[PDB]
């Protein structure tokens, strides 16, 4: 078959590779934005879903990454173990992923004292898959397998069909609604700044919806820099860093972790989470040619990508046997 | 009184400051080596004692540091939280410091799989007090209080006495045996290399005495670099980096953590742990003038320093009331 994948973020590339592996075929990746200009490049890269099928896709992804975490290749993947805190106010039940992450537990009283404003929470060990390095890795692997890349903006699936493609794999993310309307797909705008604070060895996530849910400070160490954030604005399309939000993050994070006050700011990026009540991963026969939708991963695309890639490949198989 | 402290490592400076605070006096620090040329500068700086009174001195130190850990000043102290692994073979009982460290526990099966060679171990959250930055901090504080510093090599306590000093506080560390013989004081030579591997967010200590006890690999992340080590050579006085030991560390640590293979080596230092069956913290009236010995902290001087400083100050009081 003649395959075309639309999208060169984590979903698009993970899918293309994951299919190429199951079945070997002419695979072409089309996207209007490649690294470091994708939403994937913005993300801190913490494995952790938000609060039915999806749990297994996440859990598949975790184990897959956990396999690679202690091999020499991991540096090029931008993958590493990291333990950290989740902070709430009222106590709430353990997550679905309790047993998926390494060494999950409830915070002791002594730990909770370190965060004056929060009274209940977790500690666990997870991973970070840094978007930048993962896409370079996925791209180097796809290129090794003769998967050709072209930079171009697709105006319709029909456009791609006329070219002579048997299967279209649509991993356009938040921009999907252009190619086929979907009012369930809303952009959940977020903004982060990358600061220099190497003493930070743990991630810290908070859960305070006073500003609208997910407008609450978080600190997520990376390799070179530390990601500061906590902005989630449904409906905002402004791909522009914003001063009001810049301060909101800075203030929020400084209160959590005062040591951060004298940390040099290295950068700041805006990106859009492709939010949808559930992910859209399903087959579809085009009006005028098969389509696999794989978009709407919200704020957990790196967390869940690999499970989605396999499920897309198993969908790609289901079509090849027709 | 006219006070003189001998030593400008963690013990010497912590003691001088800790006394200046309890009682306010003319305090002078004498030492032949100041930063970054002290044994204190070599140490990774992990809080963790080795395996009766001493437990409380350690525990005093921990809490004292834990107070400072979330204040803005901490960066200048070189102090930060860090979680990590201790790896053994045969299972052994929990340590005295179980309840002192944050969130102590036994490793789950799934965690133990990440270290093929080890079958039992711990996980806990501790701190790192980086020797370099702590001494700059202690020195800036002591200077703020008009504590004058002089670089000079003391040949005898009698030498210092004739100058006209009422109390001598001897924090000479491993070189103490020159000023007063002590065959219980042996140098426990160690060597470490500082590599560049920022993805390392946890410390890892191992316990395999095949090469003599404490000749076993360890990885201890710092702020800017990661400390690699595991050398403990009783009786060796060679202040010289050694190629056989350089490789031993490199090999040992690479087996624990393969990701480390392609990590650029930033530096390498040799230092001597002042080993003694127990610490020598006690008062003594000189032959020809009072002395407080405070030396022999082995591989846990940063871990225990503050408890030792307070106990030395309480000893300094006991003398002032005479
Ligand atoms: C600020 C922020 C922080 C985040 N942090 C985390 C985190 O810590 N952990 C986590 O798991 N997730 C996180 N996420 C979520 C994660 O970043 C996204 O879910 C993920 O990057 C989406 O992957 P994607 O491939 O669907 O989208 P994208 O990475 O946006 O890729 C979309 C691709 O499709 C292409 N494309 C789209 N439309 C067209 C078209 N019409 N024609 C041609 N090409 C097209 C684009 O050029 C691009 O190549 C975060 C998101 C944001 C915004
Ligand atoms: C390789 C290595 C790694 C380590 N890692 C850790 C760790 O992770 N955590 C931890 O808690 N501990 C660690 N330690 C232990 C710690 O480094 C020491 O216990 C501690 O630094 C000793 O402090 P000190 O002030 O006694 O000695 P030093 O720091 O050696 O200071 C001694 C001072 O006395 C002066 N002096 C000595 N004799 C004389 C004299 N005759 N005249 C004038 N001045 C004199 C010296 O100039 C110097 O200023 C480590 C040690 C080594 C060697
Ligand atoms: O999506 C992101 O911006 C970061 C990744 C991430 C975030 C959460 C958040 C969250 C979001 C915004 C502000 C505060 C907390 C809550 C949550 O429950 O899960 C998350 C998982 C993630 O991977
Ligand atoms: O003293 C040092 O060199 C590091 C600090 C340190 C080490 C231990 C070690 C050790 C020592 C050498 C090789 C492997 C393990 C064993 C141990 O049980 O406790 C330690 C505490 C420390 O602060
Ligand atoms: Na609290
Ligand atoms: Na094991």
Curated annotation (Swiss-Prot), chains A, B:
D-serine binds at residues 214, 218, 273, 299. It is linked to Schizophrenia: A complex, multifactorial psychotic disorder or group of disorders characterized by disturbances in the form and content of thought (e.g. delusions, hallucinations), in mood (e.g. inappropriate affect), in sense of self and relationship to the external world (e.g. loss of ego boundaries, withdrawal), and in behavior (e.g bizarre or apparently purposeless behavior). Although it affects emotions, it is distinguished from mood disorders in which such disturbances are primary. Amyotrophic lateral sclerosis: A neurodegenerative disorder affecting upper motor neurons in the brain and lower motor neurons in the brain stem and spinal cord, resulting in fatal paralysis. Sensory abnormalities are absent. The pathologic hallmarks of the disease include pallor of the corticospinal tract due to loss of motor neurons, presence of ubiquitin-positive inclusions within surviving motor neurons, and deposition of pathologic aggregates. The etiology of amyotrophic lateral sclerosis is likely to be multifactorial, involving both genetic and environmental factors. It is found in: Peroxisome matrix; Cytoplasm, Cytosol; Presynaptic active zone; Secreted. Residues 1-16 are annotated as: Required for protein stability. Inhibited by benzoate, crotonate, thiolactomycin, chlorpromazine (CPZ), risperidone, haloperidol, sulpiride, aripiprazole, blonanserin, quetiapine, 4H-furo[3,2-b]pyrrole-5-carboxylic acid, and the substrate analog CF3-D-ala (3,3,3-trifluoro-D-alanine). Inhibited by luvadaxistat, and 6-chloro-1,2-benzisoxazol-3(2H)-one (CBIO). SUPFAM superfamilies: FAD-linked reductases, C-terminal domain, Nucleotide-binding domain. Phosphorylated in the cerebellum; probably not by PRKACA, PRKCA or PRKCE. May be S-nitrosylated, which partially inactivates the enzyme. Changing residue 33 to H: Found in a patient with ALS; impairs FAD binding; 20-fold decreased affinity for D-serine; 300-fold decreased affinity for D-alanine; 3-fold decreased affinity for D-proline. GO terms for biological process: D-alanine catabolic process; D-amino acid catabolic process; D-serine catabolic process; D-serine metabolic process; digestion; dopamine biosynthetic process; L-leucine metabolic process; neutrophil-mediated killing of gram-negative bacterium. D-proline binds at residues 218, 273, 299. It catalyses: a D-alpha-amino acid + O2 + H2O = a 2-oxocarboxylate + H2O2 + NH4(+); D-alanine + O2 + H2O = pyruvate + H2O2 + NH4(+); D-cysteine + O2 + H2O = 2-oxo-3-sulfanylpropanoate + H2O2 + NH4(+); D-dopa + O2 + H2O = 3-(3,4-dihydroxyphenyl)pyruvate + H2O2 + NH4(+). InterPro entries: D-amino_acid_oxidase_CS, DAO, FAD-dep_OxRdtase. Expressed in the cerebellum, in astrocytes of the cortex, in motor neurons and fibers of the lumbar spinal cord (at protein level). Expressed in goblet cells of the small intestine (at protein level). Increased in the cerebellum of schizophrenic patients (at protein level). Decreased in motor neurons of the spinal cord of patients with amyotrophic lateral sclerosis (at protein level). Expressed in the cerebellum, spinal cord, kidney, and thalamus. Abundant in glia of the cerebellum and predominantly neuronal in the dorsolateral prefrontal cortex, hippocampus and substantia nigra. Its EC number is 1.4.3.3. Optimum pH is 9.5-10. D-dopa binds at residues 48, 273, 299. Its main location: other. It holds the Pfam family DAO. This is D-amino-acid oxidase. It comes from Homo sapiens. Belongs to the DAMOX/DASOX family. Induction: Induced in cells following exposure to etoposide.
